[PDB]
Amino acid sequence: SMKLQDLEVIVTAPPAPGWGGRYWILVKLTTDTGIVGWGECYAASVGPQAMRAVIEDVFARHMQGENPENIELMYRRAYSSGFTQRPDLTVMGAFSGLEIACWDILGKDRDRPVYALIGGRMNERVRGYTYLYPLPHHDMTAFWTSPEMAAESALDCVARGYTAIKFDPAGPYTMRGGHMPAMTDISQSVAFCKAIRAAVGDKADLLFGTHGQFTTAGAIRLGNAIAPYSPLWYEEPIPPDAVEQMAAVARAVPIPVATGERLTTKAEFAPVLRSGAAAILQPALGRVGGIWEAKKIAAMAEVYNAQIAPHLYAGPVEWAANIHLAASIPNILMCECIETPFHDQLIKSTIKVEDGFITAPTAAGLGLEVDEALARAHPYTGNGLHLEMQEAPCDY
Amino acid sequence: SMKLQDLEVIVTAPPAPGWGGRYWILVKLTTDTGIVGWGECYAASVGPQAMRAVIEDVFARHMQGENPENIELMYRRAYSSGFTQRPDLTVMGAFSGLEIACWDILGKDRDRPVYALIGGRMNERVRGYTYLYPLPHHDMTAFWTSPEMAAESALDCVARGYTAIKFDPAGPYTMRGGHMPAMTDISQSVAFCKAIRAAVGDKADLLFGTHGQFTTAGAIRLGNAIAPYSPLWYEEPIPPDAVEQMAAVARAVPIPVATGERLTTKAEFAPVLRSGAAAILQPALGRVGGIWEAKKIAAMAEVYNAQIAPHLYAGPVEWAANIHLAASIPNILMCECIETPFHDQLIKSTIKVEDGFITAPTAAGLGLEVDEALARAHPYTGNGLHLEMQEAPCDY
Amino acid sequence: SMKLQDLEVIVTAPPAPGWGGRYWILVKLTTDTGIVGWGECYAASVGPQAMRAVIEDVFARHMQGENPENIELMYRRAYSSGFTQRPDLTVMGAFSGLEIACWDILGKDRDRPVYALIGGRMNERVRGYTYLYPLPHHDMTAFWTSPEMAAESALDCVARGYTAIKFDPAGPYTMRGGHMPAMTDISQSVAFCKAIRAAVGDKADLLFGTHGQFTTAGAIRLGNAIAPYSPLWYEEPIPPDAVEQMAAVARAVPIPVATGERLTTKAEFAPVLRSGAAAILQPALGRVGGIWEAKKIAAMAEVYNAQIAPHLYAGPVEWAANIHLAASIPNILMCECIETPFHDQLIKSTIKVEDGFITAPTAAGLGLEVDEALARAHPYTGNGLHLEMQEAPCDY
Amino acid sequence: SMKLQDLEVIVTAPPAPGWGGRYWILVKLTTDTGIVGWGECYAASVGPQAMRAVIEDVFARHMQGENPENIELMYRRAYSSGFTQRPDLTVMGAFSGLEIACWDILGKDRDRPVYALIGGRMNERVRGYTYLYPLPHHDMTAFWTSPEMAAESALDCVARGYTAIKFDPAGPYTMRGGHMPAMTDISQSVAFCKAIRAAVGDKADLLFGTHGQFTTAGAIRLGNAIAPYSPLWYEEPIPPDAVEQMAAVARAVPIPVATGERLTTKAEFAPVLRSGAAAILQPALGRVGGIWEAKKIAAMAEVYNAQIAPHLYAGPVEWAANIHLAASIPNILMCECIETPFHDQLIKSTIKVEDGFITAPTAAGLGLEVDEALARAHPYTGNGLHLEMQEAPCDY
Amino acid sequence: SMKLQDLEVIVTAPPAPGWGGRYWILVKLTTDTGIVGWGECYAASVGPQAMRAVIEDVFARHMQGENPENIELMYRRAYSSGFTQRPDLTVMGAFSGLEIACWDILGKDRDRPVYALIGGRMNERVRGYTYLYPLPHHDMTAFWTSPEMAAESALDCVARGYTAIKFDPAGPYTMRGGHMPAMTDISQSVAFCKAIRAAVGDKADLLFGTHGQFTTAGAIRLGNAIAPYSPLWYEEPIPPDAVEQMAAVARAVPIPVATGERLTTKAEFAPVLRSGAAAILQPALGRVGGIWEAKKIAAMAEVYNAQIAPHLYAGPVEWAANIHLAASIPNILMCECIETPFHDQLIKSTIKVEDGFITAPTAAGLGLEVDEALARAHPYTGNGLHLEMQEAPCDY
Structure with missing residues (x-):
């Protein structure tokens, strides 16, 4: 038993x-x-x-x-x-x-594969994305304020098959709560979007990977500044503790809002959908309640014509959980990926990013x-x- | 595979x-x-x-x-x-x-049993309910407009373990659309409630099981007339084709509203929860889109602090799916039941109601x-x- | 009798x-x-x-x-x-x-002609429109992804007297539900609009004839990408199963939203107008419930200062029904037309588009x-x- | 033509x-x-x-x-x-x-009969109702403030086959606008409902036939006072020039609100339905825009699960147009009737009330x-x- | 420093x-x-x-x-x-x-005392209340379902000077989520309120001390049932994870709703107030973020004409922080008290309830x-x- x-x-x-x-x-x-x-x-x-x-x-x-x-x-x-x-x-x-x-x-x-236990192979492959990371020749300290070096990374990610790339030029997040961006923060963000878009042209989508640094006002100002470069989403414009405020950003900027990495349970995602605070949900399976809870949330997103984009700022085991959820849901958008030697060998290379995408595993569990x-x-x-x-x- | x-x-x-x-x-x-x-x-x-x-x-x-x-x-x-x-x-x-x-x-x-594949044995047993059917010594024509006989049935159901009973004294539903109940429709309704409540006292709940006969106006007049007898639900007060109107009814009467049997897919249940049209959902699994779909709806009702009461006006196979759904969801209210010799024998008595409850089946599928x-x-x-x-x- | x-x-x-x-x-x-x-x-x-x-x-x-x-x-x-x-x-x-x-x-x-039975000859002639189809010298397969050949086809439609033309460059619709457009899908939509607008100038309206391919986010991104070319409408930006979402697209893009070809009965059209999900209603009379039901819908749109644009993706019989509905309502916008030899022959040419317009029929029925x-x-x-x-x- | x-x-x-x-x-x-x-x-x-x-x-x-x-x-x-x-x-x-x-x-x-031209014979018999008018032996001036005599009239109406009767004991309407009822207005209204409901029991519905005398506050006080006697409707609780305000009464009282005898065109009825100002529409056909306009309005009512109760305080000709409208609409509720010898004579006894109902006319027009x-x-x-x-x- | x-x-x-x-x-x-x-x-x-x-x-x-x-x-x-x-x-x-x-x-x-640091002595004496606990001569296990014995306790509390007493006869709260109360749950709740109100009359307020056991529907049914006995508040009618839903209970029942003992920070209390989910906030100071956080919340309550009722199901130390908060806020309502010898001993009898009230402490801190x-x-x-x-x- x-x-x-x-x-x-x-x-x-x-x-x-x-x-x-x-x-x-x-x-x-x-x-x-x-x-x-x-x-x-x-x-x-x-x-x-x-x-x-x-x-x-x-x-x-x-x-x-x-x-x-x-x-x-x-x-x-x-x-x-x-x-x-x-x-x-x-x-x-x-x-x-x-x-x-x-x-x-x-x-x-x-x-059986986990996704086979939770609705079946809805998707043979899952679209992935990665943060823009330093290239092996980039000054690792300059790289984080360099539109020019980010564009180089973007170009490299595209050559490797990725069809979308994330980045956050918006400045530091602090313990103090939301703040108004400095004009240099705005200009920087515009320069990044300009540089990266010009680089990848149509070949990839831009994901603005903000970290909730801003007041509603600040987010709206920054949102409208980067609007022209046609970003796929605007992530966590404001801190995760004000649902109606995030919906206020959503209404005021043309960019789709993404959020969820700092939320937990369907109890918290329900109001995000219900109010229009976000059109793209980003659970961290290791936080949200697990795979099943996340299946529940993904079914909720369906009735709002919204998509899931599973968060990853952790290890390959969490990532595997994401892939299996991604594989079982009609409304998957893309899975976040972190490609490092250490990620790969912790799982002996059993699951892998292949030219931008991830194939639904065949092995058990x-x-x-x-x-x-x-x-x-x-x-x-x-x-x-x-x-x-x-x-x-x-x-x- | x-x-x-x-x-x-x-x-x-x-x-x-x-x-x-x-x-x-x-x-x-x-x-x-x-x-x-x-x-x-x-x-x-x-x-x-x-x-x-x-x-x-x-x-x-x-x-x-x-x-x-x-x-x-x-x-x-x-x-x-x-x-x-x-x-x-x-x-x-x-x-x-x-x-x-x-x-x-x-x-x-x-x-494995089905519920084991869809979240597990959340419930060892499931609360059941039945409709008030004529007793053997009942005139099967008179019975249906008889508060007195309906009460004898109520008593017989209680003695048999049932902790809830449904009836519909409110008149016929017609192809015409919702109508205003005749004043005698309201009187007969109140008299049923009076008699059935008197007979059972606290031992059972009253489920007022309308068939959407009424205009919003009529539904509200009826609801307020039977509210004193404290029914647990008021079912399909109006036709299944105006969510916002049903919510209107819900706001104007003290009784919890139940609806579902005529609805299909989560895309139709979503506006029901969102608008406050109903606090109790009653999907017919043979109609909503299957077991899986109904699991998604149950998960949706869950963030509305709402419950599922699977519909049954069909055979023992649909009932079986109802029960595997029921056993798997934390937010189950009760399962509609129909005990006839034919139901029982069509499935060689493999699943049965006992003292008002249904035990989670054990065999495969x-x-x-x-x-x-x-x-x-x-x-x-x-x-x-x-x-x-x-x-x-x-x-x- | x-x-x-x-x-x-x-x-x-x-x-x-x-x-x-x-x-x-x-x-x-x-x-x-x-x-x-x-x-x-x-x-x-x-x-x-x-x-x-x-x-x-x-x-x-x-x-x-x-x-x-x-x-x-x-x-x-x-x-x-x-x-x-x-x-x-x-x-x-x-x-x-x-x-x-x-x-x-x-x-x-x-x-008497049908229109004479349902309110009389409100309109002597009815404005028509057509999809852009390949010109005889067009590569059948290349045409569908070619802004250049579309503008050639659009120019031919203006020559034959059409004052509006429809097309859909946004990509394929799938059973998976709404997806986010690829940037190429957006680019291509823009190039189609740029090309077709430049050819026809003021001589014709552009109808962006999308098919519910997208998520609400994706639909909004696409929407104000094509806005600069002034489309008369933005059709079915998302799947037909989420009214509130379509209204969310409508509030977010400057283009008027049209929908309805996959809807049926006033019961489904009422919430579309009420929610502001669409300003233009496109019933398919062979699906919506018939000519009468469609008149009721048209009168409904009247009190929302909205118009009707009967859908045609079928034969000359449904089309005939459309035109009789058209001739009978004040709030008619235009009528979809599909001009093929077989459409003509199946009704022995009894009703014709003439220089972009259809004349109210005189014959009975x-x-x-x-x-x-x-x-x-x-x-x-x-x-x-x-x-x-x-x-x-x-x-x- | x-x-x-x-x-x-x-x-x-x-x-x-x-x-x-x-x-x-x-x-x-x-x-x-x-x-x-x-x-x-x-x-x-x-x-x-x-x-x-x-x-x-x-x-x-x-x-x-x-x-x-x-x-x-x-x-x-x-x-x-x-x-x-x-x-x-x-x-x-x-x-x-x-x-x-x-x-x-x-x-x-x-x-053909007019109804045969406008949707056909949806109804074979139309349900009717009438004001409580003085019986011969009644002091024609004491009657209008006599619950006792009104009860005698109502009882006579039931003997003639009527299943609903209307009265207004609420006091006079003035050119001043809405007023607060005197306590005597409220007590008398109550005494009327009590005496009339006692007399008719379930044999007939009470139609409270107010004339928009009251301020919102006053309307609400009166409504609550008469609720206990279970009136089928509460007519024109306030003046017809503030819909939001009439919706407010409707939300504050348990009695279905009716109105419309002072409105014209679908442009004024739409906001009534849309705001929940009334559940029962009563157009005067000789004012609202005609039979066709009434038809569009009836269709509008349908999607609000609301009904139509054609107004009559005029001659037999407008009544006839009422009957043909009623005959053709699914959501008819009842037609107001005024039975005088002169009504009869003006149309040569050609359409009649029989036992509370009116049979769909047969002669042409x-x-x-x-x-x-x-x-x-x-x-x-x-x-x-x-x-x-x-x-x-x-x-x- | x-x-x-x-x-x-x-x-x-x-x-x-x-x-x-x-x-x-x-x-x-x-x-x-x-x-x-x-x-x-x-x-x-x-x-x-x-x-x-x-x-x-x-x-x-x-x-x-x-x-x-x-x-x-x-x-x-x-x-x-x-x-x-x-x-x-x-x-x-x-x-x-x-x-x-x-x-x-x-x-x-x-x-100085803590209150002297946080706005000063707004209140010299704080009003207190207590659960109905068993009297010595009570069967300590029969008591919890005995209206009669609860009435004896309440009456003893009034003799000791309490002006408000709390109890919960509504049944058990389970890990399952909200459930529908059994009819016996409702009848017993009623019998408790009746016996306790009879005993105390006007000498004390009844605080219905539910524990979020119920679904919204069930909460509303229970609330309406106990309304007649005029309870000062209705505590945690449902689970603390659906504010919109708790607002729904509040709108559906005449009893002021109270909640908060399971919430933390002003970020969770703001939506409560904002949505009308509760008229009385009950933070547990040892959970909500401390005394300062409670102060910000109390200020928030002020602009909603709402009050604060500090929660206590812990030791004397958290109680003290409750007392100092209460002493400093205009909108205090009452402080929960638990009178055991051990509470007393742990703080050496240093702060006490006297005749139902607590006097603003004088010693430092x-x-x-x-x-x-x-x-x-x-x-x-x-x-x-x-x-x-x-x-x-x-x-x-």
Whole structure:
């Protein structure tokens, strides 16, 4: 009948230049019958050590002993934990990773690809995209304020088959809340869009990968400045804590709005759709509630004629979860990709970006072979968080 | 992979008094590997023979030769058939039954119950309800306008474990569209409620089960008249073709509004939730687009703090799908039930109501032993449609 | 007094190149007094043979034996059939054709043109428009992605007296639901507009004739990309299954939105006008519920200061119905025309486009002389639907 | 085609006690081919003498020498007269009566009843209702403030077969605008409903026939007070010049609101429906724009799940146009009736109320035989308008 | 300036019967200058052990080595931790308790009560209230379903000077989400209100203390049922994850809605007020973001003419922060109180309820003298969370 039994947490630090963050939180579950599943947690409101305790509390309290088929039940338990029953970002981070592991386990038990268990091969291939990263000759410090070098990266990404590319020239996000962009921030953003569009012409779409730096006013001003270059989407124009405000940006600029990487559960995505705050949803599966929760959200997007674009600023296990969701949904737009040697070998190259696209895996579960020894051979030893928000204010 | 190859359509007609309708449309699917699934189409816009052609077409065009795992894909094909991509009540009725059979097949192939493949056993048991049917010693003509006899039935249902009962005392629905209830329609309604509430007290809920006879004005007048007897739902107050009007009713009466049986696809249920037209959804699985589609709707009701009460005015195969949906969703209210000797024997009693509740089936697929020879022995020889809207006007 | 007695269904297949689709579903009704009427059905959710049974069911069940004068009555039965009373796309497709045939009958009985029966000659002549089709010297396959050949074709349309021309360069529509355009899809749309606008100058309006390929975001991006060339309308920017979304496109682009060819009944058109989803309504009379239902819709659009543009992707019979509707309403915009030899011959040339306009017919009924012989000598033997949604995704 | 040629206006004055008003304005049209049609104008802003000049002007400018078939065209002309194109109550009151005569003419030319021309026999019998008028033995002046005597009248109406009766005990309407009812106005209204509901029980519906006397606040207070007696409708709760405000009453009281007897054209009825100001429309056909205009309005009501209750405070001719409209619309609710010997005599007893209902007429046109001699023998010699608004304030 | 230096977490467990929960999480902060401040964390998503790691992380990352005066800055840091900047229930539960200790420290440094620091003594006495707990002679298990015994408790509370009492007879809250109440749930709720209102008369207000058990529909049914007994408020009618939905209850029932004990930060309270979801806010200070955050929220409530009713289901330390908030805000309504010997002892009887009220404290800071030894002598040895959500479904 099958029962979840063992939990291991492995925090692994990607090697410099560390595209993808300071550390990835990996979970490995084992059933009483020995079926092993991998998952990944997306949480950094507190550090990895605190998260370990959180993940183990979630697992023991709501999941250990349970039949892995009972995803609804386990979600309801974690979501309701401690008389809450409302989005707990940290707890959901914990549960999402464990839940993804459950799916990897279910695919192995059923001997099918995960997407085959959740609606079938809707898509043979999935369109991918990547951030513009420094080229092996780019001054890695200048590269981040250089329209010219970004355009070079864009050109290289296109040659590799990518049909869309993301970037954020808009300046620093801070702990202070939204701020008005400096004029130089606006000019910079225009120069980037101008340079990158001129480079790739029609061959690719531009994704403005803003990080919620701005007040509604600021976002609108910046939104209209980059409008002329025909960006596919305008990501997180304002901080994730004001739904009606983001819908206000959406109405005021011609660019489609994208958001979701910092949201969790359908409870939070529902109002985003209902108000018109975004036309493109970007869950981080390691945060949002897992694959199933994300299937629910994707069905919601359908009735708003909206598309999903799964977030990735983490490791290849989370990414695999994204691919499997992407594969099973009619309204997929594209999957975010982070192509590094370390991403590739953590899973022994089992899933791969091929000329811009990702093919639906054939292997069982997530289709991964996780290199646990490599994972353990790279411990995190910093005291920072996976991601961090600047202390200093915008520079005028 | 398994491919769907064969299709058999079987129209069977319930022996009198025919609780459940004039005929049930069963589809029996078989894959190339010899696995058999049963589905049930809920479609009566035209007769069984036209529907047979519709079902045959839909199957050959969009499903035959396809991996049964690909439910998303097949739904998209059917939904879009012929450059439509909007709800087609007749095609979707055909697809719904085929899609159901697909899940029976997948359940057998995985050797698991259907609910285990769609989120797991969220519910060990499911609350049931029945309509108030005449007792053996009841004049089967007088019964339907009799508060006194309806109360005897109410009592009999309570003694049998049922914790909820439905009735409709409000007069006939006609081809004409909504009308104003005769004042005697309101009086008879209030008298039913008075009698049934008196008899059961707290042991059961009252489900006022209208058939959309009324104009908005009329529906609101009726609703306010039966509100004192505290019904749990007010079902289809008006016709299924004006969401905003139903919401109007919902805002003007204290009773929760239930609707669904005449709706199809999530594209029609979305505006129902969005506009406040109904707090309780009642999809007919043989009509909405199948089990998967209904899972998406249940997920949608979920962010409206709303619940699902699967419709049943058909045979035991559709009921079975209702119950596998029910067992899998946290936001289930109750399942419509119809206990007749024919229902029971058509599935060799494999699924049964017990003391008002239904236990999550255990066997593979839908968990049924369909008695094909018995269904074929009961051909439909009538001229009528499964249901009919009378021609005569409301009698004043 | 006279009654509807006999029905013949005749499916006819136009010769290549096939402007008008794969087949037209013609209905011929005969009264017991021997008067003959013709009509056309617009339905392709299932194939010709299935429709035959549906049409035959609809007629036998609700129309046969009935006084043709009773349009309201027969509509209520079909609309309500089998306890539905919400739009059934397949049943209404069938009914519309029978309904149009009834009008032809009525016109022949009254010895007056149909328009004279439904409000009189409001318009002496009716403004027409056409798709841009390949000129004889055009590469058939290259033409469809060539701004240059389109402008050549558009110039020929102006020469023949057309004052508006339609085209769709935006790419393929798929069963997957709305997608985001490739930048090439946008570029190409712009080049088509630039080219076609430069050729015709003020001499003709451009109608951007899109097909619901896109997501709301994608539709908005495309929309104000083509705005600089001043299209008279922006057709079906998104799929027909999300009203509120289409209104969202309408608020965001400066172009007037037209829609309706995949809609049926006033019940579906009412929320389109009410929501501001479209300023221009394009019923297909063979689908929408017939000439009468279409008059009701046209009067509805009147109180929204909106107009009607009858859709044609079918035969001269549906077209005849369109023109009689057109001649009878104040708020007529224009009438889609498909000028092929076979369109002409099937009605022995009884109605003609002349220098871009059609003159109100004088002959009784629809004013046609249908060439049954011709129709029967062109049967449809194909396996496809009149129209079809492609399975492959948009190419990126 | 035949052309409208001659106009004859005939103002006739019902004998005492004169239920139906001070005078009816009849029009008699003759075609060049000698066909005679009768209609009725409903206009009293200015007196009989000024209205003659209005009617003669409208006829000569817009309708004389036109084919009577061209109803849309003639409406467009009158509606637009003198660069207006917005509802002109006075002009439309003239055109409505002329329009009705056109339908009478058309029915005779076609040799069918008018309803057979406008959608056919949707209804075989029309449900009727009547004001509570004094019984012979009643003090004709005490009666209007006597719940007891009103109850005797209602009870007599039920014996004659009526299933709904109307009354207004709410006090006088003044030229001042809406006022707050005196507490005595409210208590008397209550005492009327109580006595009439007690007398009729379920045998008849109560139609509260207010005359827009009250401010919104006052309307709401009155409505709530009478709610307990369950009136089918609450007529003109406030003046007809603030729709948003009437919607406010409708939302604040449980009683279905009815209005329309003082509105004209679909341009004024659209906002009523659209805002939820009324659930029941009551056009006066001699004012609203004619039979065709009433048809468009009825179609509009359909998509709001609302009904039509044709107004009558005039002669038998406008009543006939009411009956033919009612016969042709699915959403009829009931027709107001005024039973006096003079009504009967003016049309030679040709259409009658029988046991509460009216059977669809059979003779051609309106099916009337108007007694011109009797009309010309009853000249209006008074100065008063058909109806008037009190000068004196409400009495507190 | 002084800097926060040391943190000490102390989990303490109230003795039986343990009103106030399973354990309280206290924090003790010391400055480099040796000043000691106490606070209380309100978090139970995860257990005491995980929360320690959370609290220690938050303190070390964001507050250690900071001037305690910088409350805005420390909040901004914690709120934003790890690129979040949206409400994190778990992290905020940690920071809230730390924040309270900061205020205790500040009050001591300034040598004034905390309220004197945050707007001053707006109120000299705070109005209090309490749950109905069992009286000694009560069967401690029969009591919770005994209207009779609850009435005895309420009556005892009135003798002690309370002017408002809270109770919840509505049934259990489950991890499943909202459910429909059983009729017995509704009848018992009614019997509770009746017996308690009868006993207290006008001497006290009834606070219906529901726990978000119900679906919207169910919430509305329950509310209407209890309305007659005139409760001052209706607490958490539904789960805290659908504001639009809670506003819907508020509009549908006459009882003022209260909520907030499960929300955090002004970012979640703003939409509540803005949508009319609640008229009375009840923040748990140990969860919402601290005393300062509660102050901003109270100011927000002011412009909505809404009040604040500080939540307490924890120890005396959070209660103290409640009292100081209450003392400083114009729109206080009442403070929840839990009177156990252990509450008293933990703070050495230093703040007390007297005759239903609490007098503004006088000693510096929180005005408490926390008994660390008593706290450290009552370790939590259980595994359960402070509160939990039932697994079992509602019993019908």
